[model samples]
Target: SMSVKKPKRDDSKDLALCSMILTEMETHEDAWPFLLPVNLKLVPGYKKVIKKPMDFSTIREKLSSGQYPNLETFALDVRLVFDNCETFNEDDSDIGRAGHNMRKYFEKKWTDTFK
Candidate 1:
């Protein structure tokens, strides 16, 4: 018989980081034009859809609803956001640094979960 393993308590920290990143993006005025369009493309029916003003609410809703199955996938999605931003002068961009920091944060926490 196969045994099912429950998620570790530290998993919540990863989700919380996602939430914090979303909130930070929402509050940063310059983030939407870049973040929103790229994120919308990930949605099945929303590719061509144009938002008058894009906000973080859609991502927030997804996070709240358990749309992301695991932290690894969630981190991948976050990486996508950062990858897209690289085209717009990533080396010295504040957004680029933010994305890098987020990736590092995940790496450290994910590693710590096992120890």
Candidate 2:
């Protein structure tokens, strides 16, 4: 009984743009450290540092699965990834450098997508 589909084309315009950002971000060299969650086994103490962990893959899944209700909500998650990196790693570290780069890259894409 969910069939009243009129042709207005709503909502998902933002989702599609974010999806593009996420897809491009996946291939960036800076994406390495953020592709997945931090390995708890490797850095057992990381849990103590980052209360809420976030990553690109998870973001992508959220985008594709309709978990993201809108772009601003998705923006917060993207920021969380970089923020977690800053909290858990030093800027001099490889992962940390990637984090910085990835943040810049994402933000650039964000404004470009909107602008």
Candidate 3:
């Protein structure tokens, strides 16, 4: 379920940029062309409650301590490219605003759906 879009000028120039960036680093050439789309879940709940802010220590502790009883199961499966921000600059402020609204939309939708 990937979104279709035209190639950005930067995307066209990505190989050149990649070569420049990797001048000092060693990376596999075979993996370069295959890195087209990276999936990221910008959902606030996923960010704040799941991934960051709360630090995920609770989940880690639960899993490590084997406290699975009555635990609310959440499926957070998402596909993403490693270190995509190294090549792309998606502004954090804009992402924060969008994520806030999007999470509100999902929270409301899920709440209503459950009701």
13-56 per-residue lDDT for model 1 (tens digits): 77787776666555655554444444454545344433232224
Off by over 4 Å in 1: 1-9, 12-14, 38-58, 87-115
Listed per model in order, the count of residue pairs whose N, CA or C atoms clash below 3 Å is 0, 0, 0
Model 3, global lDDT: 0.31
Worst 10 residues of 2 by lDDT: 4-13
Pairs with steric clashes in candidate 3: none
Q: Give the TM-score of candidate 1.
A: 0.45
Residue runs of model 3 more than 4 Å from their true location after superposition: 1-72, 75-92
The number of the candidate with the highest TM-score is 2
The estimated TM-scores of all candidates read 0.45, 0.86, 0.25
The TM-score, computed over Cα atoms with residue i paired to residue i, of candidate 3 is 0.25
